[PDB]
């Protein structure tokens, strides 16, 4: 029993319908009792999977009625009749018909929303860190949509490369945005050799790239 799902992902607007497909490589309809041994789970980042549906079509207690399941013993669907912001997650099907119990690979669900420009912030290194010999400069892109964004570091207007790392959040369960953190890391010696520290942000919501900057040792 190999479980497959389709599509691998989807992004649709709030209030739209979403159906997720799942197939088992043999039947999980039990002839003896005419039950389908098929469950669906919802999983958000950092959390365990959460049981939504079992017996292919029975909604688990406490689950919103916009979730429903249906199926044919080998082909199954999970439907969200009206997508809500908190539904962003990965959805897994799973057969419990025959050992080993097996899971599908998951279908990732994201919300497509209107364009939202990032709020761009910058943080100089702390004096505490600088005493340790290292300087980390943080550039923050808060609550933007879509996820695609580009950060460039400029130090005294010279474009940087090779000394930063960034990561993006999962999609926000309330406003369907993303946030991004980028850290430029230099030695204290290198940091103190320059004045202007800037991150430059390009995003679909910005008519021209936004630059956020500070002068080291100035206030």
């Amino acid at each position: 029993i190999v479980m497959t799902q389709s599509p691998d992902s989807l992004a649709v607007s709030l209030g739209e319908r979403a159906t997720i497909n799942c197939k088992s490589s043999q039947t999980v309809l039990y002839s003896s009792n005419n039950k389908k041994y098929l469950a669906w789970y919802q999983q958000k980042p950092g959390q365990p999977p959460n049981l939504l549906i079992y017996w292919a079509s029975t909604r688990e207690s406490g689950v919103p009625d916009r979730f429903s399941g249906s199926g044919s013993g080998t082909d199954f669907t999970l439907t969200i009749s009206s997508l809500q912001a908190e539904d962003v997650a990965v959805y897994y099907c799973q057969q419990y018909y025959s050992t080993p119990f097996t899971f599908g690979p998951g279908t990732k669900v994201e919300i497509k929303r209107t364009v939202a420009a990032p709020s761009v912030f910058i943080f100089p290194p702390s004096d505490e860190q600088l005493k340790s010999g290292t300087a980390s400069v943080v550039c923050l892109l808060n609550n933007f949509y879509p996820r695609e964004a580009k950060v460039q570091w400029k130090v005294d207007n010279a474009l940087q490369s090779g000394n930063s790392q960034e990561s993006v959040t999962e999609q926000d369960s309330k406003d369907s945005t993303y946030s991004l953190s980028s850290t430029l890391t230099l030695s204290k010696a290198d940091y103190e050799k320059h004045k202007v520290y800037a991150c430059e942000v390009t995003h679909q919501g910005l008519s021209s790239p936004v630059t956020k900057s500070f002068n080291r040792g100035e206030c």
Binding site: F121, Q129, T169
Partner: protein, 234 residues
């Protein structure tokens, strides 16, 4: 019903991974449950490892991929069950979940209806390292329209994960704790930021609570606007 797992941390290669799941609201000997472990990894996805269950004696069944390496033992006295994985390699690194499978009479299988919170076990010969925690102080450069962003930088720890909360869990709205990045040194760093009213920075207190369980390191950092001593000429 609640399932509470032991904490994350390192196992050295060739040693034995050992986790426990403590049950409350149910008995580990329940006639109508089986107690399972599931692992979740990069590309193998969710993978059932095994289960134990009491009908009139104890029974255990294990996935073929871990045949001969796994034990899942009940502890009726503490109402717990264990997972042990023998001779782990770095590839055994994963989030492990305990979960209840609910059955009845005339049903010999069921879904996983209650889950533990997950435990990231990292297999590596490296030693743990606790993080340094640095304030990301709110300033003129982190404000916008009545709002102030502030945070903590959690730098140079190993292994994942670190837990970050704000004000001991009382502050959750507007928080972004970013996925960790892997530094060239093999250590991790992350940032956790929160957006608050700029009007009340003088009356409210913002403390990031950092917990790196693998190294038994807890740090609290108060984050405040930084006083000024520069621009020396006006």
């Amino acid at each position: 019903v609640q399932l509470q797992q032991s904490g994350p941390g390192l196992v050295k290669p060739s040693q034995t991974l050992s986790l426990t799941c403590a049950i409350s609201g149910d008995s580990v000997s329940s006639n109508s449950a089986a107690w399972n472990w599931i692992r979740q990894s990069p590309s193998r996805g969710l993978e059932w490892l095994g289960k134990t269950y009491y009908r009139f004696k104890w029974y255990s069944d294990y996935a073929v991929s871990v045949k001969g390496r796994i034990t899942i033992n009940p502890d009726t006295s503490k109402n717990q069950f264990s997972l042990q994985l023998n001779s782990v390699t770095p590839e055994d690194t994963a989030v492990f979940y305990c979960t209840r499978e609910s059955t009845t009479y005339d049903l010999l299988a069921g879904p996983f209806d209650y889950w533990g919170q997950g435990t990231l076990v990292t297999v590596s010969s490296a030693s743990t390292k606790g993080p340094s925690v640095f304030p990301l102080a709110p300033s003129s450069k982190s404000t916008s329209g009545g709002t102030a962003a502030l945070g903590c930088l959690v730098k140079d720890y190993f292994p994942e994960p670190v837990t970050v909360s704000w004000n001991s869990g009382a502050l959750t709205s507007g928080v972004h704790t970013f996925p960790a990045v892997l530094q060239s040194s093999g250590l991790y760093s992350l940032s956790s930021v929160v957006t608050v009213p700029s009007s009340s920075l003088g009356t409210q207190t913002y403390i990031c609570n950092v917990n790196h369980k693998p190294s038994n390191t807890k740090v609290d950092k108060k984050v405040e606007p930084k006083s000024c001593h520069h621009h020396h000429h006006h």
